[PDB]
Amino acid sequence: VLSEGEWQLVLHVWAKVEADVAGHGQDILIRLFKSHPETLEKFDRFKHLKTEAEMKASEDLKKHGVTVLTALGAILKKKGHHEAELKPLAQSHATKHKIPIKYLEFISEAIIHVLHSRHPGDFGADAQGAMNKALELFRKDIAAKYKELGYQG
């Protein structure tokens, strides 16, 4: 359970993201695919991209980054009261997209790195710890749905 002060730190940096959702979404997906190439393999849509320059040039990748970050932003702004938003995401990522919980840990690491790069003055250690807590809560709650459905592994 995050405290109110931890949520304020999370949402204060998140407000900075929403000024350039698409640029953040590109940096986060590119970092994810570079750091953990097994993740790229889950996207039939993107698995033709073989270089970072090709990734940065893909408008479809940029569109998907906005889809991802729009869904995460709506979850974060519920401050933990996010059951309605996670249900459908857990269900599609477990049963259709086949995304292991561990890859949600990987995209969480990429989100944190990109926020630190783009927003250092609003992403000191207190805010990094709070965002880590928020992303852990996201993963915890998605993992409980995966386990229900027979996908926690």
Ligand code: HEM
């Ligand atoms: C913060 C974490 C994430 C969020 C909020 C998120 C959100 C979404 C949303 C909103 C969609 C479209 C609606 C749906 O299918 O449910 C989607 C699609 C998808 N996601 Fe995620 N996602 C996340 C992490 C990941 C990760 C880590 C992977 C793979 C390693 C992944 C793989 C996919 C795939 C394969 C699709 C379908 C893309 C397509 O072919 O159109 N997602 N995601």
